[PDB]
DNA sequence: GGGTATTCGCCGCGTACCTCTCCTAGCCCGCAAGTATCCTATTCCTTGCAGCGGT
């Protein structure tokens, strides 16, 4: 759906490797991934959003 | 037959007052309260075989 907008969409779960999950968390805390779809991993206290609305 | 004896079972044994304790056993049925297996996250590590520098 968002294939024609400047919006970054990323997925986090156990499927994503341990090497890229940390990268995704760094990107999210930095404030560059505007959509983050995730399972219960999102509630593990290490998922810090820059500006959540 | 019957007069007698013997047994058996029923009935009976004071008044008034004070203190205290305790008045069915057990089953059932439904409440409800506390437990073994199934998926999606998590923290826990210990092996097997090929590259591979290096000489």
Automatic annotation (TrEMBL):
Name of the gene encoding the protein in the UniProt record: mfd
Which portion of the complete protein is shown here?
672 to 724 of 1148
Q: Which organism is it from?
A: Escherichia coli
Function per UniProt: Couples transcription and DNA repair by recognizing RNA polymerase (RNAP) stalled at DNA lesions. Mediates ATP-dependent release of RNAP and its truncated transcript from the DNA, and recruitment of nucleotide excision repair machinery to the damaged site.
Q: Which family does it belong to?
A: In the C-terminal section; belongs to the helicase family. RecG subfamily. In the N-terminal section; belongs to the UvrB family.
Protein known as: Transcription-repair-coupling factor
User: Where is it located?
Assistant: Cytoplasm
